[PDB]
């Protein structure tokens, strides 16, 4: 299977208070593995997955240093992007960064990503080809200028081709116990009365790795959309992930509706149906 | 320019009276970053409570899990309280055994 | 790891 990596940072600008605050976190397919804040004490990145504890002190300290560089930089461009959108010099105002690689089973990079986000619009976008931009708006087209006169998409490519591809396949064999393993959906279906001749069918995907899941209702084996129910795949803290579907039947066919689930640790789709 | 949080509230692993367990409140989608965030016990808000790092998805809306050891009662009834600049009032979803 | 020195300016 294929195996991602991908690092997330929010600056949002604090006036009151007069320092921007700076998260983020890293993660391996859907583990994460570092953060680093900056209000909290430490002033590094810290494991937040056994198998990076390994890595010694040139490793953390690297890290530290270059996140505390993106930090610097992302505060200067929001006091630029602030005059960009000739925005009020009171508010509080975010900048998003997310960027990673995708490396396939045979270990070959696959693809690269850099995109940029201000107040939870996009921004800027490294394309496909990972040698052109695409900017979201005006204040955008300035700044694709002065990077397109800077040419940041070769560091942004070297990177992304160079360092990001070889550590994450570092990373992957450091874990190999944890992020190359397939916990498949442990099911079950629960069945809730709703009225005299109403009643709602709940099926249950629980302990599931990695989050990537497909649940879907059938009524006399044709998909059922309408008095469908389905939540967002969350987390359950233990590293795996959960998920329900669920709708609503009539009184007397609930053997006519069936539950499909398809996840990468199930070799063949599930078939569930109340007995 | 600003968006409104999404809520679940739920166990780790299935609720069965006496048996230990984790509270979980996974809050998603929303924007900006700063969100308040309680469990709560019969009402009475919960101290000893811990939280993920800050992460957002494609759509740049951010998601956070805030989470506690607990045991079910059946007795205890336990919920969620978020307060969000999108939001007017606070927001409370109590917990169901089949969620 | 993460992305290395760059000092890019938006």
Same mark, same amino acid.
């Given at each position: 299977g294929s195996h991602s990596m991908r690092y997330f940072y929010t600056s949002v600008s604090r006036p009151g208070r007069g320092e921007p605050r700076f998260i983020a976190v890293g993660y391996v397919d859907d583990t994460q593995f570092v953060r680093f804040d @900056?209000?909290? &004490? @430490?002033?590094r990145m810290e494991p937040? &997955?056994?198998?990076? *504890?390994? *890595?010694?002190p040139e490793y953390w300290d690297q890290e530290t240093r270059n996140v505390k560089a993106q930090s610097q930089t992302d505060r200067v461009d929001l006091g630029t992007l602030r005059g960009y959108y000739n925005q009020s010099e009171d508010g509080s105002h975010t900048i998003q960064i997310m960027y990673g690689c995708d490396v396939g089973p045979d270990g070959r990079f696959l693809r690269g990503y850099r995109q940029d986000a201000y107040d939870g619009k996009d921004y800027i976008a490294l394309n496909e080809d990972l040698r052109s931009w695409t900017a979201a708006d005006m204040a955008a087209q300035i700044t694709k200028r002065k990077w397109e006169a800077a040419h940041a998409a070769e560091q942004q490519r070297a990177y992304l081709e160079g360092r990001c591809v070889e550590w994450l396949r570092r990373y992957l064999e450091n874990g190999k116990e944890t992020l190359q393993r397939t916990d498949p959906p442990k099911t079950h279906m629960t069945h809730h009365p709703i009225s005299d001749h109403e009643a709602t069918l709940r099926c249950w995907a629980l302990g599931?790795?990695?989050?990537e899941i497909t649940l879907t209702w059938q009524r006399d084996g044709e998909d059922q959309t309408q008095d469908t129910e389905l939540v967002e795949t969350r987390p &359950?803290?233990?590293?795996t992930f959960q998920k329900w579907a669920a709708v609503v039947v009539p009184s007397?066919?609930?053997?006519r509706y069936t539950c499909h689930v398809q996840h990468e640790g199930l070799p063949k789709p599930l078939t569930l149906r109340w007995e | 320019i600003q968006r409104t949080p999404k809520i679940q509230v739920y166990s780790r692993h299935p609720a069965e009276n006496g048996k230990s367990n984790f509270l979980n409140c996974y809050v998603s989608?929303?924007?900006?970053s700063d969100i308040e965030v309680d469990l709560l016990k019969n009402g009475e808000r919960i101290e000893k409570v811990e939280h993920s790092d800050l992460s957002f998805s494609k759509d740049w809306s951010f998601y956070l899990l805030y989470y506690t050891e607990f045991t079910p009662t059946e007795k205890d009834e336990y919920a969620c309280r978020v307060n969000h600049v999108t939001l007017s009032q606070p927001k409370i979803v109590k917990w169901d055994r089949d969620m | 790891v993460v992305v290395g020195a760059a000092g890019v300016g938006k």
């Open positions: @900056s209000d909290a &004490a @430490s002033q937040r &997955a056994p198998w990076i *504890e390994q *890595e010694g599931f790795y990695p989050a &359950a803290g233990d590293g007397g066919e609930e053997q | 989608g929303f924007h900006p | -």
